[PDB]
């Protein structure tokens, strides 16, 4: 029935991981446009009231360490937590400078049993990264689950690719920032993400010299384990 209690000294931390350059060994390309994404996200979440921090070109070790350390900080006076991942990816996994790490391992650090200071508080993860290579051609006394209160806002659906323009930046990120700027402070988290879904679904379409990737589409994917409505504002 209710909303998450937002009456805290601060909204929370917001770890932004901006992966742009990858080791030759990985063979992954230079994610041109990611800086534009990070800048836009940085400002949006700052406006939301988050204490934003941006890390860059992190190795799987740094990323894991980063999040582990964060989960060990004291979130008592925080309303929630937010992490944004901007990098290359494949189903269930995400790319570090030097390779690949399971997204599950990155987020587990915040389970209710491993970050008590965030129990009953929303832990958000926004992931801008491919989850495969499929393309969408489009058409015409209590106790709580250690795994509760997590929300994953994926840019794309399992198994599919994720689009971005080195100029404008990621579709999902472009969308997310728009809606957030316009309603971040008045709409419920699921409403916002749903509008983002529609946004990248209708207002975006691939366009490339190679016909293999021409006029392609994309639909984001939201996974919620939240137990209350979430509004970014007292």
């Amino acid at each position: 029935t209710y909303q998450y209690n937002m009456n805290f000294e601060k909204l929370g931390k917001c770890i932004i991981i901006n992966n742009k350059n990858f080791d030759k060994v990985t063979g992954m390309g230079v994610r041109n446009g990611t800086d534009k994404d990070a800048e836009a996200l940085f400002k949006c979440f700052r406006s939301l009231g988050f204490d934003v921090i941006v890390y860059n070109d992190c190795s799987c070790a740094k990323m894991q360490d980063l999040l582990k350390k964060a989960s060990e900080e004291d979130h008592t006076n925080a309303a929630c937590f937010a992490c944004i991942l901007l990098s290359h990816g494949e189903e269930n996994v995400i790319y570090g400078k030097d390779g690949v790490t399971p997204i599950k391992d990155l987020t587990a650090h915040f389970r209710g049993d491993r970050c008590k200071t965030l129990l009953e508080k929303p832990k958000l993860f926004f992931i801008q990264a491919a989850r495969g290579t499929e393309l969408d051609d489009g058409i015409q006394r209590y106790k709580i689950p250690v795994e509760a209160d997590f929300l994953f806002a994926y840019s794309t659906v399992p198994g599919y690719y994720s689009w971005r323009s080195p100029g404008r930046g990621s579709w999902f990120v472009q969308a997310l920032c728009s809606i957030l700027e316009e309603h971040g402070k008045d709409l419920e988290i699921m409403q916002i993400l749903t509008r983002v879904n529609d946004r990248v679904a209708r207002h975006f379409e691939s366009q490339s010299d190679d016909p293999h990737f021409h006029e392609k589409k994309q639909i984001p994917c939201v996974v919620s384990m939240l137990t209350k409505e979430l509004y970014f504002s007292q």
Binding site: G27, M28, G29, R31, N32, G33, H88, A130, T133, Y161, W163, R164, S165, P166, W171, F204, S206, Q207, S208, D209, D210, H212, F213
Partner: peptide, 17 residues
């Protein structure tokens, strides 16, 4: 080989517009 799958595999496919 297929350069195309090579591009997606390395995530170099980008919307140019």
């Amino acid at each position: 080989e297929t350069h195309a799958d090579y591009l997606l595999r390395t995530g170099q496919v980008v919307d140019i517009s």
